[PDB]
DNA sequence: TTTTTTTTTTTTTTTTTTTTTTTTTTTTTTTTTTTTTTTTTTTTTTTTTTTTTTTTTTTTTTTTTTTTTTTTTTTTTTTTTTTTTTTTTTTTTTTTTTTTTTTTTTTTTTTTTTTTTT
């Protein structure tokens, strides 16, 4: 897509754990995973960084 | 009374060795130069309610090319042996403790003599 290019990382997570992500240019963040709903292997949703 | 044999330290100066003055190469050391950390404030970035039109997932059906599949023969895997490196017992050496045995040096002050340089 215009926004999405290449799949990067896959992490298994429960419904109350956080996902910390990093960017190549000295940027990161810590997000709560409650606010995103599972979907069936075909879709694009929420931009977190 | 004269004359004859032998012994060594010196005229020794030259060969060998030792001692004493020298200066190339890898290991220290002071300097400048580049990586780190803490404050001000500062426009600037960034967190969080509300509305909104959107664009991707889930009713239902289709196929085809990746999922089925069996089998030959390779070739990575494992076995034994031996070498290289790592790591730890073993040994050796050295240092400190407190009473003993031994020693060794640097300068002032004056006055007189040797001992070199000009």
Curated annotation (Swiss-Prot):
Q: Which domain of life is it from?
A: Bacteria
Cell location: Cytoplasm
Q: What the record says about its domains?
A: An N-terminal fragment (residues 1-523) can be reconstituted with GyrB, but the complex no longer has negative supercoiling or ATP-independent DNA relaxation activities, although it is capable of DNA cleavage; ATP-dependent relaxation is inhibited by novobiocin and non-hydrolyzable ATP analogs. The fragment has ATP-dependent DNA relaxation and 30-fold improved decatenation activities, unlike holoenzyme it preferentially binds supercoiled DNA.
Q: How does it assemble?
A: Heterotetramer, composed of two GyrA and two GyrB chains. In the heterotetramer, GyrA contains the active site tyrosine that forms a transient covalent intermediate with the DNA, while GyrB binds cofactors and catalyzes ATP hydrolysis. Can form a 2:2 complex with toxin CcdB in which GyrA is inactive; rejuvenation of GyrA(2)CcdB(2) is effected by CcdA.
Q: Give the misc comment.
A: When the enzyme transiently cleaves DNA a phosphotyrosine bond is formed between GyrA and DNA. In the presence of quinolones this intermediate can be trapped and is used as an indicator of drug toxicity. The enzyme-DNA intermediate is also the target of a number of topoisomerase poisons, including toxin CcdB. Few gyrases are as efficient as E.coli at forming negative supercoils. Not all organisms have 2 type II topoisomerases; in organisms with a single type II topoisomerase this enzyme also has to decatenate newly replicated chromosomes.
Function statement? A type II topoisomerase that negatively supercoils closed circular double-stranded (ds) DNA in an ATP-dependent manner to maintain chromosomes in an underwound state. This makes better substrates for topoisomerase IV (ParC and ParE) which is the main enzyme that unlinks newly replicated chromosomes in E.coli. Gyrase catalyzes the interconversion of other topological isomers of dsDNA rings, including catenanes. Relaxes negatively supercoiled DNA in an ATP-independent manner.
| Family note | Belongs to the type II topoisomerase GyrA/ParC subunit family.
Protein name (Swiss-Prot/TrEMBL): DNA gyrase subunit A
Q: In which organism is this protein found?
A: Escherichia coli (strain K12)
């Amino acid at each position: 897509r215009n926004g999405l290019v290449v799949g990067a990382v896959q992490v298994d997570d429960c419904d109350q754990i956080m996902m910390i992500t990093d960017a190549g240019t000295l940027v990161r963040t810590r997000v709560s995973e409650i606010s995103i709903v599972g979907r069936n292997t075909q879709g694009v949703i929420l931009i977190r960084t």
